[PDB]
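Q: What changes when magnesium ion is included in the input?
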Amino acid sequence: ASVHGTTYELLRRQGIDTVFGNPGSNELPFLKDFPEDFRYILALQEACVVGIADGYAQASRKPAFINLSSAAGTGNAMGALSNAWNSHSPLIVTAGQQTRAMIGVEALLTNVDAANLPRPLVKWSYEPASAAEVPHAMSRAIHMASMAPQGPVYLSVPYDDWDKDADPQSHHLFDRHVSSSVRLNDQDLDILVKALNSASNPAIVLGPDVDAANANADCVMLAERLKAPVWVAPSAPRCPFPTRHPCFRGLMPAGIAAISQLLEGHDVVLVIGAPVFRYHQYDPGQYLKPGTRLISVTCDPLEAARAPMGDAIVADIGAMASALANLVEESSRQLPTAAPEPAKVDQDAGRLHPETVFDTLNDMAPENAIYLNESTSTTAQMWQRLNMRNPGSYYFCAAGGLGFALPAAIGVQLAEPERQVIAVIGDGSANYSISALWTAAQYNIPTIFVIMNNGTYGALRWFAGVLEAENVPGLDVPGIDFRALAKGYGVQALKADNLEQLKGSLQEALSAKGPVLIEVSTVSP
Amino acid sequence: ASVHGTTYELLRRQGIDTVFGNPGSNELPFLKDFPEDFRYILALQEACVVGIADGYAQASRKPAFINLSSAAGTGNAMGALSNAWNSHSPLIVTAGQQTRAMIGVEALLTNVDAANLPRPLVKWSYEPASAAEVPHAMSRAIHMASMAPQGPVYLSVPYDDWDKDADPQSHHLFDRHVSSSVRLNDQDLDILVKALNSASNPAIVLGPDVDAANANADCVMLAERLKAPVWVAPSAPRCPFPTRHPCFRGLMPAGIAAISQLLEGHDVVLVIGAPVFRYHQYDPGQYLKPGTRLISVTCDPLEAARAPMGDAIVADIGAMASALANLVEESSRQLPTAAPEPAKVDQDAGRLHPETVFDTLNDMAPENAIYLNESTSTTAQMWQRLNMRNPGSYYFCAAGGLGFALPAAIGVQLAEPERQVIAVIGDGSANYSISALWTAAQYNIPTIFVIMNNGTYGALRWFAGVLEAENVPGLDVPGIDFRALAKGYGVQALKADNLEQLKGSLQEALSAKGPVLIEVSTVSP
Amino acid sequence: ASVHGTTYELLRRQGIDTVFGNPGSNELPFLKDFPEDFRYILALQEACVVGIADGYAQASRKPAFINLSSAAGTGNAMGALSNAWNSHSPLIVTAGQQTRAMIGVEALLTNVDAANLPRPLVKWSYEPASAAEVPHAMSRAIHMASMAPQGPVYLSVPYDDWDKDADPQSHHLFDRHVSSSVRLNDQDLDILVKALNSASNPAIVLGPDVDAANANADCVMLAERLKAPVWVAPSAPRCPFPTRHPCFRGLMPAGIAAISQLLEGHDVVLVIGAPVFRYHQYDPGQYLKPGTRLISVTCDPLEAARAPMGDAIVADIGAMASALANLVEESSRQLPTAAPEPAKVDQDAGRLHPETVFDTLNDMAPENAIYLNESTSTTAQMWQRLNMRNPGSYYFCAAGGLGFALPAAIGVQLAEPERQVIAVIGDGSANYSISALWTAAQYNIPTIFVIMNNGTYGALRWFAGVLEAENVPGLDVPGIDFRALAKGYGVQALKADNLEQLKGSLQEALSAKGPVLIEVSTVSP
Ligand SMILES: Cc1ncc(Cn2c(C)c(CCOP(=O)(O)OP(=O)(O)O)sc2=O)c(N)n1
Ligand SMILES: Cc1ncc(Cn2c(C)c(CCOP(=O)(O)OP(=O)(O)O)sc2=O)c(N)n1
Ligand SMILES: Cc1ncc(Cn2c(C)c(CCOP(=O)(O)OP(=O)(O)O)sc2=O)c(N)n1
Ligand SMILES: [Ca+2]
Ligand SMILES: [Ca+2]
Ligand SMILES: [Ca+2]
Ligand SMILES: [Mg+2]
Ligand SMILES: [Mg+2]
Ligand SMILES: [Mg+2]
Ligand SMILES: [Mg+2]
Ligand SMILES: [Mg+2]
Ligand SMILES: [Mg+2]
Ligand SMILES: [Mg+2]
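A: The predicted holo structure follows.
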């Protein structure tokens, strides 16, 4: 067998059947004789390639495979990799390298010091020392991406390797099963369970690794047993809990003082599947108030190490959530009562308040819709206004890197063909990965894109106001016609200048057979 | 509180009470006002500092704290860090940096790009962005070193940071408890247990993380239940099993073909706490023979990812070994019978055969002796000839880096004051970290050093023979007087030119009140 | 031809004929069939290997070639590499890697992520992607080490590469000539010359790259023409000027305020071949006083970029010094008058003051002696008391990393067999690379080692006093018998407890046929 044949067999035996890519010369010897059982999903720029693959991996809860073009292709994707790192996305990023005979002279397309290029945004980065090593290196990449804490990995392959003879002993790679599905030993788990049972006023905080693990239902059971309020950890990349469940208390503010104030009076705070904590704004104060102790369950040693307070347990979130939910006592305390309905903001017949948009989406979207958020000034209102009953219903750029949601929404829709994906994206954010629209059109992936057009980088104007920072340049983005951009890439386009038009446009989009972009005229901050 | 006061409080609250170091200018502001409850152990060169700390950590099964002098001090220790990486040794390596005001100009003693210096031999490497961050960074270092898979970490601290005011919120760091004491979920563990119970001819292979976890006794129970032979994984850094137990089969040869041949006919091979596998010599063939399947339990994702065959489970070795030992059925098969006694090699009244030395050590040493090995051509015979009944009885440089055993033997003896440590070190190896002897003398740490003097780099002569490599320079090391070196550093010295003298010297050494070096004249290969 | 044959031919065609090494398994296929025209110099630990090679390179003014054993060997040398980086030493560091077939599994002796290991202390670091690339990679290493600014480089080679067929086109590598012997263009050089000619009170500061370039005599001519005082830049690794020439003003204090004060009243300060500046102690103030402007000529862009003041020119020091010396006008100003003789310190019949030792060395040593300094508390007095008329007469650890002088003195003596080398080394410093003594004995390299024994880390006690730092541990190093250590490694040993004995010992050492160590009892600080 050739290295080419052996590598594709390894991929298929490990459950990989799709290649997300943008091709180049160094990758042609890999992509040739492309297996008939594999799919290739082309995107027009590498931030888009990786964003699509990322959405696909996060929604499918399995690794996604990517193929990029040497250093420049890899480099174009590095902003996307920053998000993937923070979301623990299992991405296998491969890039083609020059033929071994031309690497020394640094021929055009040589990826110099290749393994260092994507650092520090990958768990493992490597270029094999010989062609016959390639299948083994691929095996390492697959497992490194897939083991807790999941994350992106990078493999660079000289293009002449693919046609070389494989080592017959590579067959031992094909069916390897590697598990990190582990939980705290019985003795210490019993101690934890007793602490939870004994708490007088427990609280629960959930992060994105809960949704990644599909631990949502177990966390619901845990919250109901403990009769505990449930918050989502700040800067949330995913939604880990049904947002209209009686215990739900919403998205935590991303500030030190704000969080300790919210947790005041709670004697035990159990954090599951989140960093402690992904703060953003400078909001100095106490990490916790006197009387509150914190216990974190995380899949990531780096998270456990850097928490400024609390105990921690490093384990698989699925295994831990299931064990805790099934072991804790049913508290005799009263179940928390549901948060009240959000207020209806006054809305005239002109430009749309974001609150109006979210209320309308919630009214019209199917109950199993999936939302993506890259409308950076409206996140708090989005979290209050969308009833998300099911797992896998929300994605937001985990490192705050714009250019995620547009392509990721296409990958999510590919992963979940029966769930309508609706990406709510600001006019500023829409540009970073605008060419991803083409992939939706070409493959007829029926994502709906809602562009919130207020003509400005609103979140930055807000932060500038907070800083009392005057005379900041570059905050306005006038003069973008999103319907024309959609037409440019072959996506049906609609405009909504008022509520009547928004309702009409959404009705049309929800009944469409392909992707649709709706440009919404929203109020200026 | 100052950063100095807060950091020492964090260290003591996290169980650290000893600093292994060689001091420099950038470290004086850390070392001043040294707490009266802490010990400082000086060594004269940094390979020695780190080797001592490494032995101490491995034997104590807890992190050891190191303080080195900027880049040059760190650099002098990097060979020692290579061993520590391979042995999963929990080492907190700190180094002083220039004052922040002088870093930009690159004043003398500036550690440039400090965090990159010890890579790739550390789990985490960092320099804090401000003085008030230092305690938090130290907390991260402690936990990163201590979490599975354990390993060395690096923290660089500008010397002006220590006198600055600490953040009062740093108190939340002091008592953090972080656990990685995890094992496979019940459902999948039951599957594993059933596979072991159903095996017709199981075999067990154990690596150093078993001894690190003190899982030895549980592995004995497991082997007795399964009625399975037990091998030690190749290139063994520690001894994970009693070497005269009936199931014990010794050290595996470090070759691909040799290992698959040894495992032939075993249907299930369970590897615990080892890489799969730390081969050395080129010995091509099948990774496993038809009919053999392999299951690896490892604490290290990097090990699980790179195994060329078998399934893997990434979990704590202590928790897994205990669970397996207590869950498996007692097989009705016959218990394996003990390996026969080693042959007595013919010995005249002249220079000592290594076999004679090991037999004599085994005869005379206490049953709870601890051995270290850096006699590179005699390892196989050492493993056959020493009855090591107890955990923590053997150490060998885990990355094959010479200069480990001499200082490590001092750290081990410090960790285990009631167990006689005997380091068996070749004449070549003895030189790498020779100045460590001084620390044994100064602190009266009563390690016994047995120098095997055959005048040559014997293992290299052997490998050259294997390669049929002629005209290799640099293989002979004549003209070293080890008694004089011992005298130079204040250690009692004895010579053994024959068996009578070896017995006399060992009797003297075993009754001595301080460290003793015995130079043994061994046969030339 | 084989890669082995082709690589040794490249080395010899590029002027390399000596390998400094400590061998290991991965290097045996390189070292076998060692060419009869090459020398191999063995040292017993890698800090010693690199120190010896460094002294050899610095004194010979040409690259030195080193061969180390995988990661652990490389790591043991990293403190030595820190000095080599700061001294711009052209060192070609090679290390053996595992066979390509065993790299993936990370067999024992695999150097993981090899090229990152010596960073940031090398100019270039690399592992070739195939065997046939090895000669080209070696060519790159040779030239990278040798081009201005000179420095260490690193090449990792899988051991199976050596026996493979070389590319016949590699012959084009053999005779490549690469020059960086460049100077400022005529127009701008004329501007510089006019500025120097027009200065009313110029001063000159010289650094180690002057001595490396053998630009010393040209700098003497320049100073005589400009009638300018000459200082040596702080933390001096080499001596760039005759120390009894009338213009000489000595070693600058390594402090910001001290230097600007010394330069006050000088309108133009010309710095040649030094960083601006290698300060050490914290001594805040003005970088330059009003009225002083600075112009730096440096071979190193990194130095030019980081200077906090002045203009800079990046060019070859030899070419620039020669051009300036020959272009400037002869000033009608009076030539500076020579510094007065140093005072004779009172000396009784007991332990030696360092001043006495240096005066005695100056009295007894040949006029072409070469000194090395690792007596850290006595540097200022050494610089005042040794008349060093010739180039290449002084070396001091350029990054302040101890363990340099003892091995470097052996390399310098090998480079300069007709010039008596005298290394003055503190009792503390002597231990870092003590085993280097063996190389001097084995190859009969007649270096004289003068150990200044005061029982303490004196420079650290001094700095602690400056910090008013109390209760610092680890500052005393009692109980070392240096005569016994010398005997241990086969070097003739003498002791000097008083001046009479010092004179007798020096007379004996200067007439000896081999290396000699003199242990001098010096006064305690
Ligand atoms: C790749 C990238 N570039 C720039 C930013 C900075 N940025 C920017 C430019 C924001 C404004 C986005 O504007 P929008 O139109 O998408 O949404 P809002 O008007 O609701 O803020 S929010 C923010 O953090 C970023 N996060 N990521
Ligand atoms: C730091 C370092 N340098 C060099 C080596 C190479 N090496 C060397 C030099 C060996 C010979 C050791 O000789 P010895 O006298 O200690 O023992 P034997 O004579 O029994 O081999 S074994 C080996 O791998 C190494 N492993 N580590
Ligand atoms: C590799 C390394 N380790 C530690 C130091 C710290 N250090 C040390 C330990 C000094 C004392 C040297 O003592 P000495 O006996 O050689 O000389 P003095 O007594 O004259 O200071 S000076 C100094 O910077 C260093 N520079 N380099
Ligand atoms: Ca906007
Ligand atoms: Ca030997
Ligand atoms: Ca001293
Ligand atoms: Mg258990
Ligand atoms: Mg699907
Ligand atoms: Mg490094
Ligand atoms: Mg379970
Ligand atoms: Mg103890
Ligand atoms: Mg010109
Ligand atoms: Mg010469």
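Observations recorded in class: The first helix of chain C runs from residue 3 to 13.
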